[PDB]
Write a protein that holds these residues in place. Sequence first.
Motif, mmCIF file in Angstrom:
data_model
loop_
_atom_site.group_PDB
_atom_site.id
_atom_site.type_symbol
_atom_site.label_atom_id
_atom_site.label_comp_id
_atom_site.label_asym_id
_atom_site.label_seq_id
_atom_site.Cartn_x
_atom_site.Cartn_y
_atom_site.Cartn_z
ATOM 1 N N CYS A 117 73.653 -25.821 -17.850
ATOM 2 C CA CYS A 117 74.158 -24.521 -17.405
ATOM 3 C C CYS A 117 73.016 -23.514 -17.193
ATOM 4 N N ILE A 118 72.060 -23.471 -18.127
ATOM 5 C CA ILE A 118 70.841 -22.660 -17.962
ATOM 6 C C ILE A 118 70.075 -23.029 -16.672
ATOM 7 N N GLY A 119 69.988 -24.324 -16.362
ATOM 8 C CA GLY A 119 69.343 -24.780 -15.129
ATOM 9 C C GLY A 119 70.090 -24.383 -13.864
ATOM 10 N N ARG A 120 71.416 -24.413 -13.928
ATOM 11 C CA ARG A 120 72.263 -23.873 -12.874
ATOM 12 C C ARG A 120 72.055 -22.373 -12.663
ATOM 13 N N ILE A 121 71.980 -21.610 -13.750
ATOM 14 C CA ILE A 121 71.669 -20.187 -13.664
ATOM 15 C C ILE A 121 70.307 -19.994 -12.995
ATOM 16 N N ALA A 122 69.271 -20.637 -13.541
ATOM 17 C CA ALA A 122 67.906 -20.583 -13.000
ATOM 18 C C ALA A 122 67.814 -21.013 -11.529
ATOM 19 N N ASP A 123 68.593 -22.020 -11.150
ATOM 20 C CA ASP A 123 68.522 -22.583 -9.808
ATOM 21 C C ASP A 123 69.260 -21.729 -8.785
ATOM 22 N N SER A 124 70.391 -21.159 -9.187
ATOM 23 C CA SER A 124 71.232 -20.426 -8.239
ATOM 24 C C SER A 124 71.144 -18.906 -8.357
ATOM 25 N N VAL A 125 70.902 -18.393 -9.562
ATOM 26 C CA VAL A 125 70.773 -16.941 -9.764
ATOM 27 C C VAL A 125 69.537 -16.622 -10.611
ATOM 28 N N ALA A 126 68.359 -16.934 -10.071
ATOM 29 C CA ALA A 126 67.081 -16.728 -10.772
ATOM 30 C C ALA A 126 66.704 -15.257 -10.924
ATOM 31 N N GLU A 127 67.145 -14.428 -9.980
ATOM 32 C CA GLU A 127 66.875 -12.983 -10.001
ATOM 33 C C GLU A 127 67.566 -12.286 -11.187
ATOM 34 N N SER A 128 68.690 -12.856 -11.632
ATOM 35 C CA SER A 128 69.474 -12.319 -12.750
ATOM 36 C C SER A 128 68.819 -12.529 -14.121
ATOM 37 N N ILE A 129 67.814 -13.405 -14.181
ATOM 38 C CA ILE A 129 67.020 -13.613 -15.400
ATOM 39 C C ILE A 129 65.929 -12.540 -15.478
ATOM 40 N N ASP A 130 66.208 -11.455 -16.199
ATOM 41 C CA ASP A 130 65.233 -10.374 -16.330
ATOM 42 C C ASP A 130 64.010 -10.892 -17.076
ATOM 43 N N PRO A 131 62.804 -10.657 -16.519
ATOM 44 C CA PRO A 131 61.579 -11.192 -17.109
ATOM 45 C C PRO A 131 61.382 -10.802 -18.571
ATOM 46 N N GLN A 132 61.749 -9.573 -18.933
ATOM 47 C CA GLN A 132 61.567 -9.063 -20.304
ATOM 48 C C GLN A 132 62.779 -9.342 -21.200
ATOM 49 N N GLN A 133 63.964 -9.151 -20.627
ATOM 50 C CA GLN A 133 65.215 -9.175 -21.364
ATOM 51 C C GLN A 133 65.707 -10.595 -21.638
ATOM 52 N N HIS A 134 65.517 -11.496 -20.669
ATOM 53 C CA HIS A 134 66.178 -12.804 -20.670
ATOM 54 C C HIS A 134 65.247 -14.010 -20.649
ATOM 55 N N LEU A 135 64.147 -13.908 -19.905
ATOM 56 C CA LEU A 135 63.235 -15.026 -19.690
ATOM 57 C C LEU A 135 62.571 -15.601 -20.952
ATOM 58 N N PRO A 136 62.140 -14.737 -21.898
ATOM 59 C CA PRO A 136 61.604 -15.268 -23.158
ATOM 60 C C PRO A 136 62.614 -16.132 -23.906
ATOM 61 N N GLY A 137 63.889 -15.758 -23.822
ATOM 62 C CA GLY A 137 64.966 -16.437 -24.535
ATOM 63 C C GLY A 137 65.343 -17.731 -23.863
ATOM 64 N N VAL A 138 65.285 -17.726 -22.531
ATOM 65 C CA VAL A 138 65.503 -18.896 -21.695
ATOM 66 C C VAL A 138 64.424 -19.966 -21.926
ATOM 67 N N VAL A 139 63.156 -19.545 -21.889
ATOM 68 C CA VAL A 139 62.012 -20.406 -22.213
ATOM 69 C C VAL A 139 62.185 -21.022 -23.599
ATOM 70 N N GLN A 140 62.426 -20.178 -24.596
ATOM 71 C CA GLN A 140 62.605 -20.623 -25.976
ATOM 72 C C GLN A 140 63.713 -21.681 -26.117
ATOM 73 N N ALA A 141 64.860 -21.454 -25.480
ATOM 74 C CA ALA A 141 65.973 -22.412 -25.508
ATOM 75 C C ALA A 141 65.599 -23.777 -24.919
ATOM 76 N N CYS A 142 64.788 -23.763 -23.864
ATOM 77 C CA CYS A 142 64.269 -24.982 -23.243
ATOM 78 C C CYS A 142 63.313 -25.692 -24.166
ATOM 79 N N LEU A 143 62.532 -24.907 -24.901
ATOM 80 C CA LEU A 143 61.609 -25.425 -25.896
ATOM 81 C C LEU A 143 62.352 -26.069 -27.064
ATOM 82 N N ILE A 144 63.425 -25.420 -27.536
ATOM 83 C CA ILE A 144 64.282 -26.003 -28.572
ATOM 84 C C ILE A 144 64.904 -27.331 -28.100
ATOM 85 N N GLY A 145 65.518 -27.329 -26.915
ATOM 86 C CA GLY A 145 66.136 -28.533 -26.343
ATOM 87 C C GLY A 145 65.241 -29.736 -26.052
#
Length: 861
Positions: free
Chosen positions: A434-462
């Motif tokens: 689902c995160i990859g779908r978000i990243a692939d289709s709505v990448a602009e909605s991932i705020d660099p400060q607000q969301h991207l650190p958390g997205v990276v971290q979740a990928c690191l956990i997985g």
Amino acid sequence: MSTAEFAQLLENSILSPDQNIRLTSETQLKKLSNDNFLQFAGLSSQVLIDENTKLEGRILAALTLKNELVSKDSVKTQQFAQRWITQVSPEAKNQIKTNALTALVSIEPRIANAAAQLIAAIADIELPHGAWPELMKIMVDNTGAEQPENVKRASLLALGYMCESADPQSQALVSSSNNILIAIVQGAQSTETSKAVRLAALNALADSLIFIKNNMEREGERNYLMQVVCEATQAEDIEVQAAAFGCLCKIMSLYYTFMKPYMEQALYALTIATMKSPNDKVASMTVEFWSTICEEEIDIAYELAQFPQSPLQSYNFALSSIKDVVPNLLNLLTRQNEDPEDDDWNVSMSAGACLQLFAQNCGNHILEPVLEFVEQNITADNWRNREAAVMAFGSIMDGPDKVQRTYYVHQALPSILNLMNDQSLQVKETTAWCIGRIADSVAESIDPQQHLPGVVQACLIGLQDHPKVATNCSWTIINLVEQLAEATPSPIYNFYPALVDGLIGAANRIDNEFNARASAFSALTTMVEYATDTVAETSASISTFVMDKLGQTMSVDENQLTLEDAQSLQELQSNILTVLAAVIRKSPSSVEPVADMLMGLFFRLLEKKDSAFIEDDVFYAISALAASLGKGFEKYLETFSPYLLKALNQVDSPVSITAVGFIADISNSLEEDFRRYSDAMMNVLAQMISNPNARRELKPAVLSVFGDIASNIGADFIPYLNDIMALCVAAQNTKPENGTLEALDYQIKVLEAVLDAYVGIVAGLHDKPEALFPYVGTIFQFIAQVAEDPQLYSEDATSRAAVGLIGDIAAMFPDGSIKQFYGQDWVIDYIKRTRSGQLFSQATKDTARWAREQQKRQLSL
């Protein structure tokens, strides 16, 4: 020869455990098929009906005859068809057909089956010529009410097989479509006792649908068929139910235009009700029915945008049905396999896929029911519900407008990233997707400060989780990087060290279960490809890693490896080599010191006993090394040449296509130091395309590399010019070898290669117009094919190249000797389309401007 001893000859050809008896029998049989085909085919048919010959010998007789009548190689099928027609007497053909029809009624289903295939192969040849008038009539007879069950079943199988093997654009099965339908409808009707006959009839029906378009155009016949298929969904046998829904799917797929009345009277309610069926496969088939509707409607919406005037027309079934269908799709998402490692397809996967199709077709209309379900279920106590909520949410990330998707991503993203900590493997796996779908289709909605650190971290956990989760996290990181590397302030590079580090950890797992290790290597390929001068230290980390990992695999004793570990080592090395090739290409800066060491390993890999599996990957890395070194590669050419010339001549092996790619690489890297190997390369390439044993993918490869050679040797190419231009002309005039989608896509590949050849030749000869003159008209014939064929012009690179040729040929002939080509409407108009074409790049538009300026210059002359 007698029946008995022909039987023994067949049995020996494979069923003997003596290898030498095998070769001799194989060879004797081939001589027999060649010297006296009549007798070969005759004896095959009377072994088939010999009740005194053992089963598999009778079955062998049928399948070896069938394989001498029918082939997947077009030239071979054309040859087998002419042999049957001219080498077998009509009387012998009659006996063989008669024998095939006798075996068809065998009470032994394995015999009746091979006969079915054989009958279909003879029909392939004969029906187009109107030989075998008795056949379709016999099929109607054989499926008649009073016939034994076996007779009915085997005859439907034969019709089935007939429809499959026939060319999809053929007219024979079309002209006898009434009798095909009569026989099929005789077996599929509810009056039929046998579930086996009904299944065979419905399976045959699906196979026949393309050939029955004339019956479908008649209201009475169409009404009756639809009535029969609908009644069949009401059968007690659940296999008959699925097959009937299967026919409804195919019918919707091919006859969308006639489906409104049937949807209104029966189909809408039927398909939506049995969506609740307790039988996974039946519930799956109704979901696929709606998936098909969406697909049809999506294609129609695309046709009213490509050709805005177009005939066809949507009925908006999906859009009308959202209130009934979507809630049923949502509930089905909760039918996941209990085993988190089971992977096998089921209705919950069908539903997810249908829901995605609904989002694409219906847009913002999908939002309300899905978001409701997501909120209702994302914090639920059942894992089935929490996973269903993430599936549903990921499924709507393509379709709705950007303003809606961006808003709901902002609302939902924190709760989705938290689910990476969930205790259910299924939930985390789907969350990663689902995160990859978000990243692939709505990448602009991932705020660099607000969301991207958390997205990276979740990928690191997985990536550190179960392999199933880790695989999805790799593909998500790929999406992240591909999408966020184009940004003007690009924020993804701040996370390169930590992302690359997590991927290296993941590429280091013990094996490739659930494709987690291979995934990680691909992600590393992406990291390398997208790297910038800013992240050189972490790009150097990958290179260090893959060199390290390659040297580890090469120290392993392959003799000692188990079946699984051998498979696993092969593919690991493949993975390493793929990243390594990318490293060499991205950074030819670090390459020249390690070059003697790299080539030492590559040669060792070619000597490696199981080099067949990796030689492709090794060739591709050597190619990359060549491109990097240019002249510096020449020192290796004399030791590498033996491997190269061997691979080139393996014309039925994919390594030969890769080897051609190597010539393209050095011709471009040495270009004029290339002149001295050019004549010898030209001779080798001419023999590779002359060879009948050649893999089809090689013709396009060889034609394209002629452009690379010509481009790089210039006026030295002139003595080869007429030979090469003849191969291009014959290529551009070759039609699809049949009516399939595969033969068509191959024609397109050939044509794309001819374009590459012309591009190279024009470039190499741009200072030698007199040599090119006689061929200008031929090159414009090819350009006119690009302008006419949609699978050519709509492609950015194909249009840039074609219009580039228009303008370059113009600049080449300022004397007005070819100006009449330039006052053609089609040429002017195609230039205008390439200039405008909304989905063309700015490099493609600039090239069209250039051709327009050159074309205008030509008119003044």
